[PDB]
Amino acid sequence: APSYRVKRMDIAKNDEECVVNAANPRGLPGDGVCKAVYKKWPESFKNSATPVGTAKTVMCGTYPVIHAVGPNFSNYSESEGDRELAAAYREVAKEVTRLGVNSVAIPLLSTGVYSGGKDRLTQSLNHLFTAMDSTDADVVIYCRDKEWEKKISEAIQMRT
Amino acid sequence: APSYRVKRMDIAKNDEECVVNAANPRGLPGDGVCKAVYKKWPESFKNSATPVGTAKTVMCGTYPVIHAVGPNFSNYSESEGDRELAAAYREVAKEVTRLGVNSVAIPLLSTGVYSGGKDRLTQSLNHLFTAMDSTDADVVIYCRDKEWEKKISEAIQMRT
Amino acid sequence: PSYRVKRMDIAKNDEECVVNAANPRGLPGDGVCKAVYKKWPESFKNSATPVGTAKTVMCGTYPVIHAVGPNFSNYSESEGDRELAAAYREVAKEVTRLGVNSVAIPLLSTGVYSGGKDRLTQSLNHLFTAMDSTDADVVIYCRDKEWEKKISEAIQMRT
Amino acid sequence: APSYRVKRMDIAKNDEECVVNAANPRGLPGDGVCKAVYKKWPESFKNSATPVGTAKTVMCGTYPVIHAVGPNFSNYSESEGDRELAAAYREVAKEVTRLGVNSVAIPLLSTGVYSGGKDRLTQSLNHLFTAMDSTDADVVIYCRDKEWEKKISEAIQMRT
Numbered sequence: 001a002p003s004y005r006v007k008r009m010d011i012a013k014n015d016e017e018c019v020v021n022a023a024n025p026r027g028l029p030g031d032g033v034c035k036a037v038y039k040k041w042p043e044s045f046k047n048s049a050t051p052v053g054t055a056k057t058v059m060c061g062t063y064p065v066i067h068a069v070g071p072n073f074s075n076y077s078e079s080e081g082d083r084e085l086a087a088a089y090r091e092v093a094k095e096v097t098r099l100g101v102n103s104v105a106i107p108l109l110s111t112g113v114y115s116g117g118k119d120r121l122t123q124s125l126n127h128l129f130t131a132m133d134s135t136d137a138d139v140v141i142y143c144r145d146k147e148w149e150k151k152i153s154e155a156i157q158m159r160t
Numbered sequence: 161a162p163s164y165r166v167k168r169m170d171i172a173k174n175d176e177e178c179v180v181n182a183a184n185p186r187g188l189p190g191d192g193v194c195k196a197v198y199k200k201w202p203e204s205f206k207n208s209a210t211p212v213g214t215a216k217t218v219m220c221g222t223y224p225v226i227h228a229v230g231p232n233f234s235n236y237s238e239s240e241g242d243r244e245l246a247a248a249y250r251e252v253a254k255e256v257t258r259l260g261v262n263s264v265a266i267p268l269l270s271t272g273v274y275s276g277g278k279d280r281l282t283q284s285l286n287h288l289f290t291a292m293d294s295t296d297a298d299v300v301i302y303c304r305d306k307e308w309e310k311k312i313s314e315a316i317q318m319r320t
Numbered sequence: 321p322s323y324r325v326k327r328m329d330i331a332k333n334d335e336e337c338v339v340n341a342a343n344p345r346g347l348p349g350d351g352v353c354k355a356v357y358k359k360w361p362e363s364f365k366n367s368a369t370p371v372g373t374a375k376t377v378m379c380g381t382y383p384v385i386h387a388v389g390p391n392f393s394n395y396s397e398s399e400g401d402r403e404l405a406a407a408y409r410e411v412a413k414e415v416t417r418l419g420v421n422s423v424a425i426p427l428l429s430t431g432v433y434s435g436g437k438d439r440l441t442q443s444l445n446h447l448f449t450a451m452d453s454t455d456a457d458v459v460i461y462c463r464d465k466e467w468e469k470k471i472s473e474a475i476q477m478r479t
Numbered sequence: 480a481p482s483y484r485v486k487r488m489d490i491a492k493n494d495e496e497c498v499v500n501a502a503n504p505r506g507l508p509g510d511g512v513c514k515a516v517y518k519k520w521p522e523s524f525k526n527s528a529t530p531v532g533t534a535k536t537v538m539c540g541t542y543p544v545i546h547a548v549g550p551n552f553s554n555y556s557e558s559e560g561d562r563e564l565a566a567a568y569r570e571v572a573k574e575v576t577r578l579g580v581n582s583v584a585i586p587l588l589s590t591g592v593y594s595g596g597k598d599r600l601t602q603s604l605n606h607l608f609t610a611m612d613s614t615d616a617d618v619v620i621y622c623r624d625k626e627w628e629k630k631i632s633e634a635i636q637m638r639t
């Protein structure tokens with residue numbers, strides 16, 4: 001019985017079986033979720049580079065870390081960006097399957113420094129749901145804001 | 161004359177002035193010891209969320225429940241987890257002291273589903289002693305395994 | 321009451337009794353408590369006493385006053401200040417009851433019980449306040465050069 | 480089956496059951512590996528002084544820090560320094576065995592500011608192998624230079 005969940009804290013401080021990193025295409029430390037991921041899991045960044053709209057697993061010991069590269073909407077148009085964001089989440093779902101875990105911590109890709117100024121909560125979350133709906137894992141979504149916790153909560157409740 | 165004792169029984173039926181819950185950061189029911197604590201004192205889980213390495217007290221009536229959150233060693237390194245386990249027990253001693261109680265019931269934190277498949281009896285117990293040695297409360301340690309009871313009892317005996 | 325300070329091991333004091341910076345469970349512990357345990361081990365027989373209290377146990381005829389200051393890691397600043405005053409108050413009572421002319425005393429709650437905070441002034445002010453009620457010579461023991469200078473100044477500006 | 484591995488990262492974020500500090504015989508914080516170690520485990524430097532060619536374990540909570548003092552080759556002759564470097568690793572092996580740990584994080588001793596201006600990758604690594612081959616522990620070697628990572632990896636693989 002796979003479920004969707006949402007919790008307001010640092011995604012590094014998680015009690016799920018794996019984590020998705022909001023990564024850049026060069027696999028460098030960056031900022032945001034990527035900083036906290038580089039702090040708690042620096043070993044995961046070895047050969048973590050992968051193109052925009054793709055994902056890549058690097059295990060640090062026993063806990064898998066999936067580097068998902070959403071588009072930077074400063075470089076991408078809204079049209080082309082939307083395709084790449086869908087593509088990134090598609091590979092996250094695959095990696096949650098193709099590896100084969102039971103739970104996953106996942107941030108909303110392209111909703112911070114890659115957002116290009118715009119609020120992309122609903123956009124990113126809908127691409128998250130679309131891709132992850134074909135997986136067996138318990139999904140848990142992370143963020144630093146309470147408004148965002150409530151709006152993600154209502155999103156989850158009104159589809160169940 | 162403050163003492164340490166060990167009892168092999170359900171901590172939900174303790175004979176002490178407060179109880180430590182082996183809690184998760186989400187203040188959810190959980191499983192095992194955390195489930196039995198939720199069954200006996202359900203209303204103590206209102207706003208009981210507190211991060212790893214901390215303890216938060218919530219009253220069930222006037223009976224204090226100290227929600228102590230040890231690290232999950234599946235998701236923490238040996239180094240970082242050891243530091244957070246020490247911090248969790250330190251905050252338990254803080255809360256026992258704040259409440260003014262003469263006795264406290266306590267489980268061994270990070271020793272079950274949070275142990276990362278490692279025997280952490282000695283690790284958890286030494287952090288417990290280290291924290292609680294500066295308090296004047298009677299401490300009763302609760303376990304379920306008969307062998308663990310023996311090894312905990314021996315550890316208590318060779319301090320005096 | 322007189323007041324002095326010396327930078328040396330309190331286990332080698334030259335006073336008629338000693339105050340142990342004790343823990344509530346009567347355990348040998350570390351720091352000043354360990355040194356006290358090495359020189360006067362038999363004074364730790366039933367030496368456990370609650371926070372903010374003192375209990376005298378004789379080693380031969382030499383009284384060891386086990387005073388338990390609060391660990392400021394466990395106590396709030398409010399409750400810890402009250403318990404620190406209570407510990408020193410219990411010491412002064414025992415010094416009066418024993419009838420000693422002198423006493424060796426450390427600064428309670430200033431080391432591993434400090435909660436990462438400088439409590440020289442706090443502990444010393446509770447010391448003065450409690451130990452002014454006796455007429456015994458008080459000798460304070462530390463191991464830091466800085467502490468010795470600060471403790472000296474606080475004695476002189478109250479003469 | 481115990482392995483040797485190499486990771487190019489800060490040893491202070493290791494995922495092993497204990498760490499070897501590249502130390503000085505004074506027991507002082509220093510620079511390089513020693514600084515990072517001092518920042519993560521400062522209480523392990525309490526009475527950590529140990530002579531050149533020896534190692535000394537100081538606990539930080541329950542996490543062992545093994546202070547190992549390789550020779551400064553600026554001060555030593557090539558033959559005497561070689562003897563002291565080998566001895567230091569021998570003492571590391573003893574501590575690892577005595578602690579009963581399943582794994583250890585270790586730097587290459589005498590290869591930076593103690594190198595005397597020479598490349599001692601092969602010299603130091605072979606003394607490490609000689610000592611640690613008699614232990615049951617997984618060994619993870621930590622370095623910072625990309626090249627050194629490759630050469631250490633090659634050296635590991637051509638033994639198996």
Ligand SMILES: CC(C)Cc1cc(C(=O)O)[nH]c(=O)n1
Binds near residue numbers: 024029031115
């Ligand atoms: C290191 C980071 C700048 C890379 C990043 C940031 C976001 C974001 O803005 O949430 N999303 C993403 O897919 N990648």
Ligand SMILES: CC(C)Cc1cc(C(=O)O)[nH]c(=O)n1
Binds near residue numbers: 182183190230275
């Ligand atoms: C709901 C529980 C899974 C949370 C928990 C379990 C232990 C334990 O394994 O004993 N410790 C702890 O601090 N917290």
Ligand SMILES: CC(C)Cc1cc(C(=O)O)[nH]c(=O)n1
Binds near residue numbers: 341348353354387430
């Ligand atoms: C065995 C010790 C940890 C007990 C102790 C330490 C201090 C202190 O930190 O000076 N004060 C005190 O009253 N008791």
Ligand SMILES: CC(C)Cc1cc(C(=O)O)[nH]c(=O)n1
Binds near residue numbers: 511
């Ligand atoms: C504080 C540090 C200067 C001490 C040090 C440095 C090296 C080294 O050069 O890698 N090796 C060693 O055994 N000890």
